[PDB]
């Protein structure tokens, strides 16, 4: 239900571009409701291994919803919780997810939580995932920008 | 001449094994009581509100380890060694001369030894470990049942009161569930394995008599703990073992005890039926008969303790 | 290709020959001003042989035309060095290298 | 900007600290390629400068120290730590020269144990094999090594910094390095401990470290107070506990090595004495009654039984029962007393004079002073205290991992150890093609080693089979099919080396059977019980029931794997049935005889599930044995693995198993009504006419066109028929003609 609400609210890109369909009174509260939905989504799975394992199927949706400029603050926390609690979604992460995370770091400024997300990506619960390590090394280190 | 004319390394290895098996295994080691005495002294060359002597810190650490919620209890060698140390600090030191003075002095010494560590939360620790074992047998619960027996030796009213208060305060089902599971996993006299063991002994098996029962010591320890739970005619704990008002479910450990007794009686009857034809029972049959009768005696004593103190 | 220049003159008559160990002190950098590797920070010289390359082609060609201490600035273009495959965490795929090398080989 | 400017800029400091954390995490767990690549970003000079920077912020200082460690020393320290748990002391002359270093050492009066961690040791540990970093080399991965740093200069620098920090911590300065005592001591203590485990520090450096830790006790016989006498937080106390644990481990290893060194001399003396005794028995002693009691009771027992009773000299003082001269017993008792004195169980406000007393007093003082909150420090302190109080038990537990070898096999066992360490290092890496190839090559190199089949006890002590089984558990719980075949081949070869290896591998039979072309876990399970009467008798009923259920399932439902390739579609798969029946033939037939219980139970389970007998011997509508064989023959010459041969192979294997389960003749002739009941069940299962017809099938024999063995009838099928006929039916006068 929260996923459906977020999808319906996030169809419109901004709070003014085709977001006044409900009226000018609801334009200002759209961002607040989106942020509240993201925070509730983060809280519903924060620390619950079973919930994170069940929610891992929406990894592509979570990664795609990371470039909304208003939902990033909650979607990043959701992704971090999913990666920390259930370290099995690491194996099903391709290079495009890492590239999207690096693009988020480049576009949203120097954030210290993107680095934590990358660190969670690098190493599993005791086994080293060399694919993610090499992908991050090749996509981040050589360009000293 | 198989001893010499051999490579020196092979003889060295054999000598190492024999020497370790024959000489290094000293009995006393004179360290079980000394460690507990040293850890029980607080504020040495210094100094209530602050946490007292290291023994209580260690007990609290093990209680925290047991309290962490998880689906399985890991095998902790440190807990095994330290629980054995605490158990031997009381049981190994205090498990013709029937004078009142000597007997009462022994009783007071045992009471002081048990109070040295049951006032530091060991009674809670034993219950928490038994509950966290989830009814799975092993060396994790063998060292806990023995420690609980050592603390409860002689029928301590204070320890029984503390355990019952903890059980009635937590109101968490699972301790008696684990007890019931452990009782259900107890073995009986097996006739199918007896013939296989007889054939194996008549040409290694790496042991002797390790397939008939192989856990009679654990069964005796479990039933001794159950009996000592209500040794001093503890009416409250005798009622708790039957119906748990606070808990949402009742297990009725007494019925489990009588069921295991019935199973053991059936096994003994089958053994007698097998040995009816022969005139003289051989040594190996007598060993199994004695090792089953000891467990039967322990179960009978535990059943008596449920009734005495009407 | 190689675009060797001169920083400090050498001797001009002791060029390295085939089957010799060339000892050099080099500082590498991209064509951006960003240094990626140097040998002086490791406090040890770099030794390599001609005909047993074990180095990029541009470095070997640049070190070929030296004479006992001639500091040079070699410009190793693509398809002469690591090339399109590049180096993970090290030079990007399509980038040329500039080396500040000094042939201090003592034979 | 200056990196020291981050002290007041807290926004960039967090980002740089997490960047260093990312650098460590990317190259974590033996990723030496990324470790080599990171040297281009964080050079050696930068790390060395940051090590000595006294104005760096605490988080940045700790991050740089941990980055240097995780880049240059992590994998090698992990390998050395893994190897430190096992002792393999060769019989080299320096090992012989090694003494106990007891309280009564070379220079002493039975009072001083010496200094732990300094001396001579001979336990075999492979080197580190570092490689220099270079980004100008030509591009060519065969196990890339860690980047190389000068270890001597690093060790000297670390010692100098630790001494400077110890000296500066006594003055109670208001501006500690890194802003706190923890940020001043923990980053350098971690490096010191890592280099100590690496075995880089020399004897003089070890003595210097011991003096710095506690100069009152660790000196050679208000003034430079040691680390243990200062007021340190819990983070520094954890590192101190690790540092002391290293010295305790060194003392235990020294004790084990000294015990082996004494064992060499005692074995030599005992061999000489026994040779002299046998010479006396042979040349002399011709007047008694052959001395059969003094000969058959000592020189006829196995050498293991010739050494256990020979060690019953003392500990009772009244039961010798051994031909041991008194002086030899006195020497061994003197060594035993010295060993007991070393273990702190000697003597049948003073400052401590030994490591055990100092550690125990320090732990008790730490726990008494403050209520420790961090669980890790509490656990470490109590584990150290337990080890110090009880040393004899620690030696007893460490003894089974101790082994003695001749100096002529050191070169081979070093390669074997290196391969085992490669396996252990690869055990913590996500499964992949390059990793699979490397581990397969290492397993093959372990196989080809001559040590592997010469010291099976050493192989079992190292737990090699457990490591390889953990690898198989990881890969199985499909992907990487070649790896499981290599693993099962290694386990199968390991099982046949010795009886003890097979007994040890038998304990995992349930897991091996549950997870059931190349080698298979079923092959390992079969090889773990083959030709072992004691193991066969100990086999559990549920183990056979699982195989029976698998056989029923495979017989009832055909595997679609063969249907995927070009093959006719049928409702029953014979290949799986034959494979499952192969295992059961080893659990009922051992050394030519038959085990009664296993045969009875497998017969009962087989008859209670008729589907295991195939589509011919099931019941109503069955074609019969002759019809099934003829149908398979007819299938063999038309397109309709090569199907048709397996059809007869499955029936032949089933009949062979049924014949092998038949009761013995003397069982039948000596009553045993259950034997005749089983024989009657087998009799009614299949008639004599079927067997006689089966043996009567004809066979097929430019050059002559010989039919392919794998796509035609083979007399090996008739061999099962003949065996079954012999073992139940027999011939007296009737069938002996036709």
Swiss-Prot record, chain A:
PTM statement from Swiss-Prot or TrEMBL: The N-terminus is blocked. Channel activity is modulated by phosphorylation.
Top-level taxonomic group: Eukaryota
Tissue: Detected in skeletal muscle (at protein level). Fast- or slow-twitch skeletal muscle.
Subcellular location, record wording: Sarcoplasmic reticulum membrane
Complex and partners: Homotetramer. Can also form heterotetramers with RYR2. Identified in a complex composed of RYR1, PDE4D, PKA, FKBP1A and protein phosphatase 1 (PP1). Repeated very high-level exercise decreases interaction with PDE4D and protein phosphatase 1 (PP1). Interacts with CALM; CALM with bound calcium inhibits the RYR1 channel activity. Interacts with S100A1. Interacts with FKBP1A; this stabilizes the closed conformation of the channel. Interacts with CACNA1S; interaction with CACNA1S is important for activation of the RYR1 channel. Interacts with CACNB1.
Family classification: Belongs to the ryanodine receptor (TC 1.A.3.1) family. RYR1 subfamily.
Note: Binding of [3H]ryanodine indicates that the heterozygous channel is activated by Ca(2+) concentrations 4-fold lower than normal. Single-cell analysis of cotransfected cells shows a significantly increased resting cytoplasmic Ca(2+) level and a significantly reduced luminal Ca(2+) level.
UniProt comment concerning the protein's domains: The calcium release channel activity resides in the C-terminal region while the remaining part of the protein constitutes the 'foot' structure spanning the junctional gap between the sarcoplasmic reticulum (SR) and the T-tubule. Pore opening is mediated via the cytoplasmic calcium-binding domains that mediate a small rotation of the channel-forming transmembrane regions that then leads to channel opening.
Record's protein name: Ryanodine receptor 1
Record organism: Oryctolagus cuniculus
Portion held of the full protein: 486 to 630 of 5037
UniProtKB/Swiss-Prot annotation, chain B:
Organism this protein belongs to: Oryctolagus cuniculus
UniProt record similarity statement: Belongs to the ryanodine receptor (TC 1.A.3.1) family. RYR1 subfamily.
Subcellular location: Sarcoplasmic reticulum membrane
Modification(s) after translation: The N-terminus is blocked. Channel activity is modulated by phosphorylation.
Subunit composition and interactions: Homotetramer. Can also form heterotetramers with RYR2. Identified in a complex composed of RYR1, PDE4D, PKA, FKBP1A and protein phosphatase 1 (PP1). Repeated very high-level exercise decreases interaction with PDE4D and protein phosphatase 1 (PP1). Interacts with CALM; CALM with bound calcium inhibits the RYR1 channel activity. Interacts with S100A1. Interacts with FKBP1A; this stabilizes the closed conformation of the channel. Interacts with CACNA1S; interaction with CACNA1S is important for activation of the RYR1 channel. Interacts with CACNB1.
This protein's domain notes: The calcium release channel activity resides in the C-terminal region while the remaining part of the protein constitutes the 'foot' structure spanning the junctional gap between the sarcoplasmic reticulum (SR) and the T-tubule. Pore opening is mediated via the cytoplasmic calcium-binding domains that mediate a small rotation of the channel-forming transmembrane regions that then leads to channel opening.
Additional remark text: Binding of [3H]ryanodine indicates that the heterozygous channel is activated by Ca(2+) concentrations 4-fold lower than normal. Single-cell analysis of cotransfected cells shows a significantly increased resting cytoplasmic Ca(2+) level and a significantly reduced luminal Ca(2+) level.
Binding site for Ca(2+): 231, 305
Expression tissues: Detected in skeletal muscle (at protein level). Fast- or slow-twitch skeletal muscle.
Name the record gives this protein: Ryanodine receptor 1
Coiled coil (UniProt feature): none
UniProtKB/Swiss-Prot annotation, chain C:
Family: Belongs to the FKBP-type PPIase family. FKBP1 subfamily.
Any one Gene Ontology cellular component term annotated for this protein: cytoplasm
Described purpose of this protein according to its UniProt entry: Has the potential to contribute to the immunosuppressive and toxic effects of FK506 and rapamycin. PPIases accelerate the folding of proteins. It catalyzes the cis-trans isomerization of proline imidic peptide bonds in oligopeptides.
Upper classification of the organism: Eukaryota, Metazoa, Chordata, Craniata, Vertebrata
InterPro entries, per the entry: FKBP-type_PPIase, PPIase_dom_sf, PPIase_FKBP_dom
Documented EC number(s): 5.2.1.8
Gene name of the record: FKBP1B
Organism name: Homo sapiens (Human)
One example GO MF annotation: signaling receptor binding
Source species, domain of life: Eukaryota
Name of the molecule in the record: Peptidyl-prolyl cis-trans isomerase FKBP1B
Alphabetical list of PANTHER family matching this protein: PEPTIDYL-PROLYL CIS-TRANS ISOMERASE, PEPTIDYL-PROLYL CIS-TRANS ISOMERASE FKBP1B
